[PDB]
Amino acid sequence: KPRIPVVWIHGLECTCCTESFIRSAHPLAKDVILSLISLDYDDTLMAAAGTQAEEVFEDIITQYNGKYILAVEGNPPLGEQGMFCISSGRPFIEKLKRAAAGASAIIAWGTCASWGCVQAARPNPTQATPIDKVITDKPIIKVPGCPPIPDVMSAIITYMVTFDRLPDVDRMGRPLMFYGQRIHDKCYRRAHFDAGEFVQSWDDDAARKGYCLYKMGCKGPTTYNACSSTRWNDGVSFPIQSGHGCLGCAENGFWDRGSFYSRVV
């Protein structure tokens, strides 16, 4: 049976979301690519380069016009006529718009594509802009996080393939399944928060007993994600479990809400 065509493009980014994707434990990324979708264009993994890659891009968006999913990693810069990010000699934004026009729906992977992430932090030298500010006529599913959880990425993929539909979303376009609740509302250290049992400085007796990281600047109370339930890397850990407060990395403008070590207001 034919597999659903997927075009994956990259703007200004660090590639962590692509890296997170291939960490998937179930299904393995190998099995997603071989059996679940047809990953028809992807700069990180494809054999073809240059004019050969351009030919694949053109061929796929033409042949499957209206029928492919567009995955976007990173974002377009509006500064310097878009030439902070250049693809085939032209502004990345042109490639974004062309790919978006033929897509049935768009997945905005990561805080970059969803909101802006680090390049959009003050003073945003390139005028990096999230996808939904440029593409205004297409369904966009935001999957934020820096990067999002590997098995969250693959679970969203398998949901769409299995149920033949987009996941239901909150008012910001995030899948309710994984972004409906706060880190702090499923945090295994919540008992300590409620008891007033806090780490006060690194490696103190409190830290060695796994006490709450609130006074160390944990942004769990204002951050929506699955990290404290689904956890990371096949359920091995998450930021808080390994001793560091949540940075807020799934939330819009998290880089610019004061120091990571200042308390939630």
């Binding site: 890296e19 990324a29 700069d43 380069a49 902070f84 000699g89 990371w232 001793g243």
Partner: protein, 581 residues
């Protein structure tokens, strides 16, 4: 057209111009242009970074304790290495010493990155330049099994296994949905592996794609998550508790047991899959020991890495040697000082940035990141580059030099430095490796050599993982559990004005972060990253960087199909997000 001489090369932009944009199977955005002569030989090469984000600008005004988190996002492929450089730099500026366990865990984080990054590069990035995936469909599964078993003790080698892999590829291809294999260079005369070796390599590509996910569980234990683990100025946040109440809330014996199981499996896979495959690529592609030499027989650079004595970054402490060779004089390995303003300098006369005087290079403590998109007279327009003008500004990458010399960095560079400083393990390993291929030592200074050194390094790093883990366990047995120093955590304890350098060897080569702190905030933060060195554009003397030099003089069999270009570029493992930051 124009012609000039530099570094033993004749740079000639006469003849047919070829453009490769996008470069794929790299991180980030790169454009390459070459000119070829009537013999289809490259006479000019142009390396262009086609992205910029401006982390050096963004870091201004941040709390120095927060810096690692921002700069970690320079790159998701070499994830963690910028956070390490950052905490080193801030600690150097403020005057902070970390506890021994923190240093050991940081070394573990780095060695884990080396293993992961090198493994995935070999298979997922460079692999398809050497392995003809479609040609695997012609392989005899029994002959493939026999080949695999002649090269390695790796268990997974049955004829039925190779038949299953082949059949899966066959069904994948049959429907016409070739995905990442579409419009590839399959059948190119430079693909030299027999069908059985293509099927073996493709099977291993899939095994590596599965396995790589397990390696990073080490980052998850100590750093919470991968990609983008967490760190702190003063050590690491992963407090240890082995034998007291509350060990369920810390790094305990079960967590350490997990780490040990990953280390063993990581060494096993690298030693028995990647190493034999790299040697096999060597055996079937020996002419590539003479292609893509570039600067590797002229100028190479390592800062050194893995300080084994906590807080000591001197020669006696670093397990990975630093030093510089220039003018092809490998008998004189030179000491490197990252504070010396006459050593590391960056030029922008051929890059998209403003300096008050673009004819001079600036040490990073005097660095300036003032972006200026000005491509001059391309064929095309400002928003439609048909041909970059390499006589003027052509890249978002700055041009680093060392004492005014253009240098190669990375696994080959490091190997040559260690070999020539007389590191006994390196000499023995290199000599044995070239002997196995019946090639002279000079054969390492090539595109093939870069690949062989990278594999050797993955083996070296997997061994060091065990070494560091044992070091950690030894401290624990002696009741030494400390993972953070907090004496100078509070801004009130810092010097009002100070500056520091954090350096290491990232998977792709020499990495430095230069930071100045004033009044509790980042006053300046300048990065010079390994791919910045290698993918560098030209300087005021017209000297070419490692990529451009490595491409020079290269024969192409079919100009329209840039396989030889991709082979040599991919051999450096380009990370474009790193190069531009």
């Amino acid at each position: 057209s124009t012609q000039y001489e530099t570094q033993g090369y004749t740079i000639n932009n006469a003849g047919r111009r070829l453009v490769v944009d996008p470069i794929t199977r790299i991180e980030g955005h790169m454009r390459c242009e070459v000119n070829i002569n009537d013999q289809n030989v490259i006479t000019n090469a142009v390396s262009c970074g086609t992205m910029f984000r401006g982390l050096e600008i963004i870091l201004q005004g941040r709390d120095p304790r927060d810096a690692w988190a921002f700069v970690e996002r320079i790159c998701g492929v070499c994830t963690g290495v910028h956070a390490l450089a950052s905490v080193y730099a801030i600690e150097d500026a403020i005057g902070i010493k970390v506890p021994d366990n923190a240093n050991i865990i940081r070394n573990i984080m780095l060695a884990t990155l080396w293993c992961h990054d090198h493994l995935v590069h070999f298979y997922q990035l460079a692999g398809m330049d050497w392995i003809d995936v479609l040609d695997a469909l012609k392989a005899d599964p029994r002959k493939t099994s026999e080949l695999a078993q002649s090269l390695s003790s790796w268990p997974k080698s049955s004829p039925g296994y190779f038949f299953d892999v082949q059949n899966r590829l066959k069904k994948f291809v049959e429907g016409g949905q070739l995905g990442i294999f579409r419009n590839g260079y399959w059948g190119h005369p430079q693909y030299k592996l027999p069908p059985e070796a293509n099927l073996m390599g493709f099977a291993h590509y899939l095994e590596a794609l599965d396995f790589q996910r397990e390696i990073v569980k080490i980052h998850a234990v100590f750093g919470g998550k991968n990609p983008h683990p967490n760190w702190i100025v003063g050590g690491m946040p992963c407090a240890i508790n082995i034998d007291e109440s509350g060990a369920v809330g810390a790094v305990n014996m079960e967590r350490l047991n997990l780490v040990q199981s990953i280390i063993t499996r990581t060494a096993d896979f690298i030693n028995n899959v990647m190493i034999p495959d790299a040697l096999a690529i060597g055996q079937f592609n020996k002419p590539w020991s003479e292609i893509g030499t570039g600067l590797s027989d002229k100028c190479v650079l390592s800062y050194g890495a893995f300080p084994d004595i906590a807080n000591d970054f001197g020669e006696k402490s670093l397990l990975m040697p630093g030093g510089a060779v220039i003018n092809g004089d490998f008998n004189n390995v030179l000491p490197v000082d990252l504070v010396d303003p006459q050593q590391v300098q960056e030029f922008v006369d051929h890059a998209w940035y403003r300096y008050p005087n673009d004819q001079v290079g600036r040490h990073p403590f005097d660095g300036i990141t003032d972006p200026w998109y000005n491509p001059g007279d391309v064929k095309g327009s400002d928003t439609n580059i048909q041909q970059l003008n390499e006589q003027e500004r052509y890249s978002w990458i700055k041009a680093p030099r060392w004492r005014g010399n253009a240098m190669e960095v990375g696994p080959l560079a490091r190997t040559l430095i260690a070999y020539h400083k007389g590191d006994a393990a390196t000499v023995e390993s290199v000599d044995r490796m070239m002997s196995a291929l019946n090639l002279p030592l000079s054969g390492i200074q090539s595109t093939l050599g870069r690949i062989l050194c990278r594999a050797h390094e993955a083996q070296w790093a997997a061994g060091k993982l065990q070494y560091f883990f044992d070091k950690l366990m030894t401290n624990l047995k002696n009741g030494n559990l400390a993972t953070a120093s907090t004496e100078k955590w509070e801004p009130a304890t810092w010097p009002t004005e100070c500056r520091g350098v954090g350096f290491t060897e990232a998977p792709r080569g020499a990495l430095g972060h230069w930071a100045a702190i004033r009044d509790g905030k980042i006053d300046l933060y300048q990065c010079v990253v390994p791919t910045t060195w290698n993918a560098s554009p030209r300087d005021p003397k017209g000297q070419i960087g490692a990529y451009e030099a490595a491409l020079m003089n290269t024969k192409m069999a079919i100009p329209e199909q840039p396989l030889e270009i991709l082979r040599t570029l991919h051999s450096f493992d380009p990370c474009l997000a790193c190069s531009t930051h």
